[PDB]
């Protein structure tokens, strides 16, 4: 979904925004423009306030009098905007006129009037937007007025920073913006003293926010360095953010009060107000706050430190003030002055400190101020209660409202995002959500107002106004997710199967119709969690909690697959499982089991709300005992029927049932089964729980899976734990590999294969595919019984070789000389005459022990001594040659295994060369 | 158009005219000529009746017997003309033959016969035309005859005035013009008695008009003074106009009746018949007249008084007689005689009065007359109903006819004009039109006959015959005009879009096809009378009354510019306005608004009949609020948009709309704005509803329109009603004129100029362009603050002149002596030694008060006393010199302002001379 927005109709600029309580029309102040928009943010009307030829330096602007200074077309910035409902108009105060104010008709934006002539008609030279604020207060005729604060820019004589002014009925009337009570001695206005300007050149009061409360008017302000920070002479300017207040009723301006305000977080100071918003707590916050319904609260935003009002720091904190607490601080302060203690202490106003005069008085909240101990400041800075702090992205603006008693706070960010915060000090928690309706790259402005209906929140940017909906629970699809988010507005409208606020849910008041906590969802359980595929139409009981009255009717849907009607009794729902015809359509190809999300479909809504893990487990498919029992599910194996089933009764008879894996029928392993090719040999086997074949059932067979040939040999089952294939010989064609492992399957009654967990195999080995030489065979294990047969020039078992002579040769225990040693090749071909070389000789059929080879090696005449570690038996000899000084030059290498017998000696093919 | 006419073919003369009922051929009697013409007045045939050698004195003319008296070629005047259809000929009775009659064949004018031989064949010596008349009455054979009356000229033995004569079939036959029944005792003729001739020498009966009615024959006659006026002996002759009647059936001539006739108007007597015409009334006149369809009426024309039959008076009146009324008068008279009361009373006929004899009789209308109480006269003159009277131009002739029941009367005038009169006593109204088809200079004759078809009316003049069309409605272009004229013949043929009679309009009988009254036109209205230029294709509803069925189809045409189709529903027409593309093409350059005549174009005719005022008003063009609202049209101004538009919605927003002129934005005046050149001064202004500049809008500036230099100074708008340009100095180059008013324009947001109704200006004044002298400056207003600066010898404000010394001089309140008086010139240069002279001295820098100058003036030593009234301060002194007897002769004039101080005195350039 996209958020409805109004792009800077003048793509060029934007400054202030306000909403009409009745209409919902949105008025937007901007530079050179003032717009009237619909609730939807469609452009209703555009007013051209802009570019006027003018010059800031000139006093009474060009229209009244001629100015020596040159003029230029300049932009007129909307400094302020205030809705005057009674007058049915809009006060849209600009600048660049010496700050002349304009009156636009409410409906059409028709300019009712814009008083320029008198001095009062000029507010301030100041070009900056938002540095001004104020409130319009009205009563029936003969009671009324406008309170406005603005920066001076060092214009102290020309304009008052704070004033109480008149708003006549007729826009044409000359009287406008005149001071409520003007006397030669005192006027309902406060000017900045010239002395204070000389001392600190730049001093100026910037008014951020302002609101009327009870019967007073408050302003959040920023001021300069005056005794803060201390400094003998001018240099750097830092600001102090303070609260100001006035009685509506005080024409005299005696009521003025000014307290510094801020808050600290773990030793970090937040002194500068970015924005504020007066609001109500609602039942939730108020209770724990300890307030009356009527009592007000002030949300604020402050940046860290005293530095750079023009461009503040990212570090920012949202604090809170209860008006009762501030009222107390003020009353406390006044009751003190009346004590006669200390001075008034207001630096910018009164350079010379005047003392407070003691007097008898009943100090109340009603106290409007008196002639003596006149305008006064404040010593103790009022601290606020911190709420949320953003380090990375500075908060710019804030708003708040009461929703179902929970207090939702809105906070603009430098990024163009809005945070939706439930304040739960009085409750318990933090920030619920963040949104970027606005503008992804760059920030939001202080004027952020909720609509009259409070459906949306218009968020203003330099560039655009964006209608950000407050609560937007609809985004949440399921009860689990809805309640999961936690943003307090959202609840699960059970019957509607949607997520929204209490007000939005029809009949939410009724029981279990609306769910606040996850527990209410919905939690569901089914008593028969697991049902077998074979079973049909089984009775199931459903336990559900935190659900509304279902009397409308409910259906059980296992999945999109099926749906069965249910009847309700007690606090349970009774439905039936699907038919066998229906159940397997699902189960097929899922195999072992299929977990399915059984849902409940409500009759009224027609949407599945609640779910549970439901298992369909089909035992019958299992072909063997191991899969049946040993598997993950509850299945029973029937030894006799040789079928796997859920029901015990289905088995042939009681003795036949297999509950445990140990009890199955399986083949136990023994020492490796060695099988020579072409030899008749029996193969004994061990195993457990071998079944006695029943009537109509045949006996046991051994099946060998050899690709070349598969052998079927019948066997005898001696007892429950032993088997034996009958005398037979096996072979494979190829002579490719010596040792071939083969899978064997033991079967009975033709097809029934007994389980083989170990997966024992039979090793068919053929006597030397690998060994052409007598030395290699005798080298091999004595277990094989494989031995060298002289006549054939080959090596096989005695069984395999005919005995013309009494003997075939087997290494009796290594006491068997062999024979025919050969030298393939040797390393270092050449060597020095001096000797010392390490010759590495590699041969095929050498001696088995080192001791015999030692003294055996010779290079020609030269004696060579072999190395023990280096020597790998019958494969390789590493030997070190001795002194070569002899006459030969080149000579062949000789190895005599034990003795240099004629059969026993080997000579190198190529000779070793000495150089 | 010109009227078809026949010029006196004999250019020489003209006398009588008649139309053939079947053919339409027109026969025209004239002197020496008888013409046959076509309906068109083309010459068909000309007959020569003329110049015959003859002599009036001779009895049986030369042909029959020899005459002693000398003959001369004389003209033969056509006395009478009568169409004999049965005989297929024309009786054209002439004169100069002793009145022999001629018979011309109908078609060719071939002379069938002209009986001369017998005495009867001679009608009368009388040369005058028109003094004769008569009727031809015919029946099948063995029933028939001709009745003719003529003047005698004192020929009583020769000819009968009235006779009943025979008209035989054969023109050759001798029998012609023989009396119907001739007896030795009584013949069907009436002669004038010799006795009556001796008594009154000249007595003669002139017969003007004659007609047959029912079964009688009537004649309108003129006679002489016989008992009227009373007179012992002959002297003057006056005439009495009377009516005569006879039964057609009375061979005996017993039926003769004679009533005097006339009519009076407000005590004015109209006794002399000019002409008459028997006719029908038609339904309209008859009804109110109270007559049967068959009943006849007699229109007549009479001149005022009894005098000069030969040349009557201009005063003439058209009267009326209903035949029923005259018949009643006759029956009434007869029933009376039968009573035996009184005498017969017929002066000319019976000199000796014979009494009426009583007798039992049923007196009916049928009564033909009896042997006793034989021809009789009448006592009571029958009065007629007056209709129209012309004082200025005498009526000569008359005709009338029935048209669509309305009775139209035609009246010739002495001028040669015809009047078309609808007689509406029985209806209600008067004279509709007058025409000069005829002959512009001089008159029309009694023979005026309508054509058979009654399309035209042949109007005869001495010189020419003119075919004057009766009804000529075609002249009228629009329904409004057509119905406007009122001449009853005309109606608006809606679909044809023409003006004509009912008979002429095809399908006029159908509903709303023909319009009689203006209301029927057409009256049109459009509901959206005013439509804005900005609007397009607006629905308009059209309300029209008195229109025929439009189902043929109608189009809306705003003007010649565009035309849009329309659909009809109910009694309304729905059309659409033009498109914006179309509408402004019109609007451009007309500005404020353009009224356009939206017409309706009928599908059948294709002519625009009906119209309405349609306004196109484009608001947008208005540049300023004043023009927009303050103007003449409904336009709204949008303060914020600063645009003018018809639609309220288009304005920026509700508060922005300007409906009323007061609400605009305008600059109010203050005391005159005085601005010195080269001085830094602010200029405060007052105004109303100054706008607050909205977004994207700049502030206020003051622009001075000075031709030399235009200054742009920015200003501040304090509130909706006050402004002020900032401290600056202004100047203009030239030093030509002291006070220069300058137009100033206040602008905001660069171009927007605020309205200046008063058109207030700034007066730039420079300290004495006008005043070189100290006296002149101090004289000027204290307001200017302008004063005289001694060191410079010039005059300017203190600001303007450097103070080495503590003072620059200003008249503190006139207590400031100045200085350096000078005398330019004085009048009377010379004077008498005795004195008394009034010296008129004219100078530049004199005293401000009279009191100081008095006693100041001296001519040399001689004391001179000044005159108060005569004295114009510091410009001129009028002074009267005292006695000069001193020795000097000539001396210089001196004026000492208050005191004769050395700085303070002035002496004349030229001296005053005493002689």
SS3 assignment for A521-577 = CCEEEECCCEECCCCCCCEEEEEEECCCCCCCCEEEEEECCEEEECEEECCEEEEEC
Q: Per the omega criterion (within 30 degrees of 0), is the bond before B303 cis?
A: no
- SS3 label, residue B246: strand
Going by C-beta distance under 8 Å and a sequence separation of 6 or more, which residues neighbour residue A872?
none
Query: Which of A110, A113, A116, A173 to mutate: most B Cβ within 10 Å?
Result: A110
CA nearest to B656 within chain A: A110
CA distances from A49 to A12, A53, A79, A109 (A): 14, 12, 12, 11
Nearest to A48 among B696, B699, B720 (CB): B696
Token pair 């005696």: residue: A254
| Tally of CB atoms within 10 A around B828 | 13
Are residues B692 and A109, on separate chains, in Cβ contact within 8 Å? no
Strands A700-705 and A739-748: antiparallel
Token pair 């301030």: residue: A124
Report how far residue B766's alpha carbon sits from residue B676's, in angstroms, rounded to the nearest whole number. 6
Report how far residue A115's alpha carbon sits from residue B699's, in angstroms, rounded to the nearest whole number. 12
Single out the residue of B188, B259, B244, B245 nearest to residue B214, CA to CA: B245
Are residues A63 and B653, on separate chains, in Cβ contact within 8 Å? no
Single out the residue of B195, B214, B189, B240 nearest to residue B375, CA to CA: B189
Q: Is B327 exposed, middle or buried (0-12, 13-18, 19+ CB in 10 A)?
A: middle
CA distances from A863 to A833, A860, A907, B118 (A): 13, 8, 15, 227
Report how far residue B418's alpha carbon sits from residue B410's, in angstroms, rounded to the nearest whole number. 6
Report how far residue B766's alpha carbon sits from residue A877's, in angstroms, rounded to the nearest whole number. 144
Token pair 């114009």: residue: B872
Report how far residue B573's alpha carbon sits from residue B551's, in angstroms, rounded to the nearest whole number. 11
Q: Which of residues 679-718 of B touch A (CB under 8 A)?
A: 692-696, 699, 714, 716, 718
Report how far residue B812's alpha carbon sits from residue B823's, in angstroms, rounded to the nearest whole number. 26
Neighboring chain A residues of B693 at a CB cutoff of 8 Å: 111
Distance from CA of B609 to the nearest CA of A (A): 54
Are residues A173 and B719, on separate chains, in Cβ contact within 8 Å? yes
Q: Quote the tokens at residue A252.
A: 């005299």
Nearest to B699 among A63, A112, A171 (CB): A63
- SS3 label, residue B234: coil
Report how far residue B605's alpha carbon sits from residue B496's, in angstroms, rounded to the nearest whole number. 5
Backbone angles phi, psi at B547, to 5 degrees: -130, 150
Neighboring chain B residues of A108 at a CB cutoff of 8 Å: 653
DSSP A693: P
- Strand pairing partners for A222? A206, A241
Report how far residue A98's alpha carbon sits from residue A76's, in angstroms, rounded to the nearest whole number. 10
Resolution, rounded to a tenth of an Å? 8.0
Report how far residue B612's alpha carbon sits from residue B525's, in angstroms, rounded to the nearest whole number. 6
Instruction: Indicate left, alpha or beta for A759 from its phi (over 0: left) and psi (-120 to 50: alpha).
Output: left
Neighboring chain B residues of A118 at a CB cutoff of 8 Å: none
Q: Which of residues 585-644 of B touch A (CB under 8 A)?
A: 640
Nearest to B714 among A49, A63, A171 (CB): A63
Query: Which of A30, A54, A117, A119 to mutate: most B Cβ within 10 Å?
Result: A117
Q: Quote the tokens at residue A802.
A: 């005919």
Report how far residue B56's alpha carbon sits from residue B99's, in angstroms, rounded to the nearest whole number. 10
Report how far residue A764's alpha carbon sits from residue A675's, in angstroms, rounded to the nearest whole number. 5
Q: Quote the tokens at residue B892.
A: 């210089």
- Strand pairing partners for B806? none
| Tally of CB atoms within 10 A around B714 | 16
Single out the residue of A797, A787, A858, A796 nearest to residue A818, CA to CA: A787
Backbone angles phi, psi at B97, to 5 degrees: -110, 5
Are residues B693 and A65, on separate chains, in Cβ contact within 8 Å? no
Domains defined for chain A, CATH in brackets: 475-520 (3.30.1680.10), 523-616 (2.60.40.10), 629-658 (no CATH), 666-765 (2.60.40.10), 823-914 (2.60.40.10)
Is residue B654 less than 8 Å (CB to CB) from chain A?
A: no
- SS3 label, residue B289: helix
Report DSSP letters for A41-106, one per residue.
Answer: --EEEEEE---EEE-TT-SSTTTTS--SS--EEE-------EEETTTTEEEEE-SSSSSBEEEEET
Element (H, E) at A128: none
Q: Which of residues 159-178 of A touch B (CB under 8 A)?
A: 171-174
Task: Give yes or no for a contact between A398 and A275, defined as CB atoms under 8 angstroms apart.
Answer: yes
Are residues A64 and B699, on separate chains, in Cβ contact within 8 Å? no
Q: Quote the tokens at residue B639.
A: 């303060």
Report how far residue A350's alpha carbon sits from residue A72's, in angstroms, rounded to the nearest whole number. 39
Neighboring chain A residues of B695 at a CB cutoff of 8 Å: 47-49, 109-111
Report how far residue B127's alpha carbon sits from residue B32's, in angstroms, rounded to the nearest whole number. 12
Instruction: Indicate left, alpha or beta for A177 from its phi (over 0: left) and psi (-120 to 50: alpha).
Output: left
CA nearest to B694 within chain A: A111
Task: Give yes or no for a contact between B52 and B41, defined as CB atoms under 8 angstroms apart.
Answer: no
CA nearest to A107 within chain B: B653
Neighboring chain A residues of B653 at a CB cutoff of 8 Å: 108, 110
- Strand pairing partners for B27? B18, B36
Backbone angles phi, psi at A568, to 5 degrees: -115, 135
- Give the E-state strand segments of B185-271 in sequence order: 189-190, 206-213, 216-223, 240-247, 257-265, 268-270
Neighboring chain B residues of A171 at a CB cutoff of 8 Å: 692
CA distances from A26 to A37, A68, A79, A450, A461 (A): 5, 41, 17, 11, 14
Are residues B695 and A48, on separate chains, in Cβ contact within 8 Å? yes
Torsion of CA A7, A12, A17, A20, to 10 degrees: -70
Going by C-beta distance under 8 Å and a sequence separation of 6 or more, which residues neighbour residue B899?
none
- Give the E-state strand segments of A566-635 in sequence order: 567-569, 572-576, 594-602, 608-616
Report how far residue B898's alpha carbon sits from residue B907's, in angstroms, rounded to the nearest whole number. 15
Backbone angles phi, psi at A333, to 5 degrees: -65, -40
Backbone angles phi, psi at B491, to 5 degrees: -140, 160
Neighboring chain B residues of A49 at a CB cutoff of 8 Å: 695
Neighboring chain A residues of B640 at a CB cutoff of 8 Å: 110
Report how far residue A446's alpha carbon sits from residue A487's, in angstroms, rounded to the nearest whole number. 23
Is residue A88 less than 8 Å (CB to CB) from chain B?
A: no
* Residues B274-298 as b or e (16 or more Cβ within 10 Å = b): bbbbbbbbbebbbeebebeeebbbb
Task: Give yes or no for a contact between A159 and A148, defined as CB atoms under 8 angstroms apart.
Answer: no
For chains A and B, what is the number of CB pairs under 8 angstroms?
36
Are residues A172 and B726, on separate chains, in Cβ contact within 8 Å? no
Query: Which of B653, B657, B684, B692 to mutate: most A Cβ within 10 Å?
Result: B692
- SS3 label, residue A119: coil
Angle at B892 between CA B887 and CA B897, to 5 degrees: 125
Token pair 């304005």: residue: B651
Backbone angles phi, psi at A840, to 5 degrees: -115, 110
Are residues A63 and B716, on separate chains, in Cβ contact within 8 Å? yes
Neighboring chain B residues of A33 at a CB cutoff of 8 Å: none
What sign does the dihedral B478-B479-B484-B488 (CA atoms) show?
A: positive
Report how far residue A852's alpha carbon sits from residue B36's, in angstroms, rounded to the nearest whole number. 197
Element (H, E) at A118: none
Q: Per the omega criterion (within 30 degrees of 0), is the bond before B229 cis?
A: yes
Task: Give yes or no for a contact between B838 and B882, defined as CB atoms under 8 angstroms apart.
Answer: no
Is residue A108 less than 8 Å (CB to CB) from chain B?
A: yes
Strands B876-881 and B862-866: antiparallel
Are residues A66 and B694, on separate chains, in Cβ contact within 8 Å? no
The CB-based long-range contact list for B585-590 (8 Å cut-off, 24+ gap) reads: B585/B561, B586/B558, B586/B559, B586/B561, B586/B616, B587/B533, B587/B616, B587/B618
Are residues A64 and B653, on separate chains, in Cβ contact within 8 Å? no
Task: Give yes or no for a contact between A313 and A304, defined as CB atoms under 8 angstroms apart.
Answer: yes
CA nearest to A49 within chain B: B695
Residue B443 CA from chain centroid, whole number: 25
- Strand pairing partners for B220? B209, B243
CA distances from B763 to B432, B682, B706, B781 (A): 69, 14, 11, 15
Neighboring chain A residues of B652 at a CB cutoff of 8 Å: 110
Single out the residue of B652, B650, B629 nearest to residue B639, CA to CA: B652
- Give the E-state strand segments of A177-304 in sequence order: 189-190, 206-213, 216-223, 240-247, 257-265, 268-270, 272-279, 297-303
Report how far residue B313's alpha carbon sits from residue B679's, in angstroms, rounded to the nearest whole number. 94
CB-facing half-sphere around the CA of B704: CA atoms within 13 A: 25
């Amino acid at each position: 979904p996209s958020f409805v927005t109004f792009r800077g109709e003048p793509a060029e600029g934007f400054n202030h925004l306000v909403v009409d309580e009745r209409t919902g029309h949105i008025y937007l102040g901007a530079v050179n423009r003032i717009y009237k928009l619909s609730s939807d943010l469609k452009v209703l009307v555009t007013h051209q306030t802009g570019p006027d030829e003018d010059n800031p330096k000139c006093y009474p602007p060009r229209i009244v009098q001629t100015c020596n200074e040159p003029l230029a077309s300049t932009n007129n910035v909307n400094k302020m905007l205030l809705i005057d409902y009674k007058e049915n108009r809009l006060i849209a105060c600009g600048s660049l006129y010496q700050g002349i104010c304009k009156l636009l008709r409410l409906e059409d934006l028709f300019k009712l009037g814009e008083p320029f002539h008198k001095k009062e008609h000029y507010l301030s030279g100041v070009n900056e937007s938002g540095s001004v604020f104020g409130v319009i207060v009205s009563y029936s005729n003969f009671d009324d007025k406008l309170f406005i604060a603005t920066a001076v820019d060092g214009k102290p004589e020309y304009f008052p920073t704070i004033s109480s002014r008149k708003l006549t009925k007729n826009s044409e009337a000359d009287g406008m913006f005149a001071y409520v009570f003007h006397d030669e001695f005192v006027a309902s206005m406060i000017k900045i003293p010239s002395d204070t300007f000389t001392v600190i050149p730049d001093f100026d009061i910037y008014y951020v926010y302002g609101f009327s409360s009870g019967n007073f008017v408050y302003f959040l302000t920023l001021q300069p360095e005056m005794v803060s920070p201390p400094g003998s002479t001018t240099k750097e300017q830092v600001y102090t953010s303070k609260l100001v207040r006035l009685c509506k009723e005080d024409t005299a301006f005696n009521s003025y009060v000014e307290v510094p305000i801020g808050c600290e977080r773990n030793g970090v100071e937040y002194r500068l107000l970015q924005a504020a918003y007066l609001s109500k707590a609602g039942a939730v916050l108020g209770r724990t706050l300890g307030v009356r319904p009527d009592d007000d609260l002030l949300f604020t935003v402050f940046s860290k430190g005293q530095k750079r009002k023009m461009k503040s720091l990212d570090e920012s904190a949202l604090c809170i003030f209860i008006l009762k607490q501030i009222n107390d601080r003020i009353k406390d302060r006044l009751q003190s002055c009346y004590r006669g203690e200390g001075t008034l202490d207001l630096a910018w106003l009164k350079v010379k400190d005047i003392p407070c005069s003691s007097a008898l008085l009943t100090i109340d909240d009603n106290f409007c101020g008196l002639d003596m101990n006149a305008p006064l400041g404040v010593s103790e800075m009022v601290r606020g209660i911190p709420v949320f702090t953003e380090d990375r992205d500075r908060m710019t603006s804030v708003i708040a409202y009461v929703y179902k008693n929970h207090s939702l706070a809105f906070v603009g960010t430098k990024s163009g995002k809005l945070k939706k915060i439930r304040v739960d000090g009085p409750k318990g928690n933090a920030l619920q959500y963040e949104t970027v309706q606005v503008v992804d790259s760059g920030p939001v402005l202080r004027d952020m107002a909720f609509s009259k209906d409070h459906e949306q929140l218009y968020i203003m940017s330099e560039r655009q106004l964006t209608r950000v909906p407050v609560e937007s629970c609809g985004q949440y699809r399921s009860c689990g997710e809805c309640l999961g988010s936690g943003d307090p507005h959202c609840g699960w409208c059970v019957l509607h199967n949607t997520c929204t606020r209490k007000e939005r849910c029809e009949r939410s008041r009724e029981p279990r119709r609306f769910a606040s906590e996850m527990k209410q969802c919905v939690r569901l359980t089914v008593h028969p969690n697991n049902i077998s595929v074979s079973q049909y139409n089984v009775l199931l009981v459903l336990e559900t909690y935190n659900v509304p009255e279902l009397s409308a009717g409910v259906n059980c849907t296992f999945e999109d697959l099926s749906e069965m009607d249910g009847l309700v009794i007690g606090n349970q729902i009774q439905c039936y499982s699907p038919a066998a015809k229906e159940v397997p359509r699902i189960i097929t190809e899922n195999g072992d089991h299929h977990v399915v999300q059984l849902q409940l479909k409500s009759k009224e809504t027609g949407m599945t709300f609640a779910s549970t893990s439901f298992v369909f487990y089909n035992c019958s498919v299992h072909n063997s005992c191991l899969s049946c029992v040993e598997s993950p599910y509850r299945c029973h194996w029937c030894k006799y029927r040789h079928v796997c089933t859920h029901d015990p009764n289905t088995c042939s008879f009681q003795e036949g049932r297999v509950k445990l894996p140990e009890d199955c029928p399986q083949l136990l392993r023994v020492d490796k089964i060695l099988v020579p090719v072409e030899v008749i040999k029996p193969i004994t086997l061990k195993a457990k729980n071998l079944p006695q074949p029943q009537s109509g059932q045949r006996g046991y067979e051994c099946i060998l899976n050899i690709q070349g040939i598969e052998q079927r040999v019948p066997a005898l089952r001696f007892n429950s734990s032993s088997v034996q294939c009958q005398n037979t010989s096996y072979s494979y064609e190829g002579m490719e590999i010596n040792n071939l492992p083969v899978e064997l399957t033991v079967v009975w009654n033709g097809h029934f294969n007994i389980d083989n967990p170990a997966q024992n195999k039979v090793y068919l080995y053929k006597c030397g595919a690998m060994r052409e030489s007598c030395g290699l065979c005798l080298k091999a294990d004595p277990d094989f019984e494989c031995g060298w047969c002289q006549s054939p020039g080959q090596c096989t078992l005695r069984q395999h070789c005919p005995a013309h002579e009494s003997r075939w040769l087997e290494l009796s225990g290594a006491n068997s000389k062999c024979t025919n040693p050969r030298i393939t090749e040797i390393i270092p071909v050449t060597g020095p005459r001096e000797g010392g070389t390490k010759v590495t000789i590699r041969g095929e059929n050498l001696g088995l022990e080192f001791r015999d080879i030692a003294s055996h090696v010779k290079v020609a005449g030269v004696e060579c001594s072999p190395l023990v570690d280096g020597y790998i038996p019958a494969e390789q000899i590493v030997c070190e040659m001795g002194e070569a000084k002899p006459s030969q030059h080149a000579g062949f290498v000789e190895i005599c295994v034990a003795v240099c017998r004629p059969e026993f000696m080997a000579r190198s093919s190529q000779l070793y060369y000495f150089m």
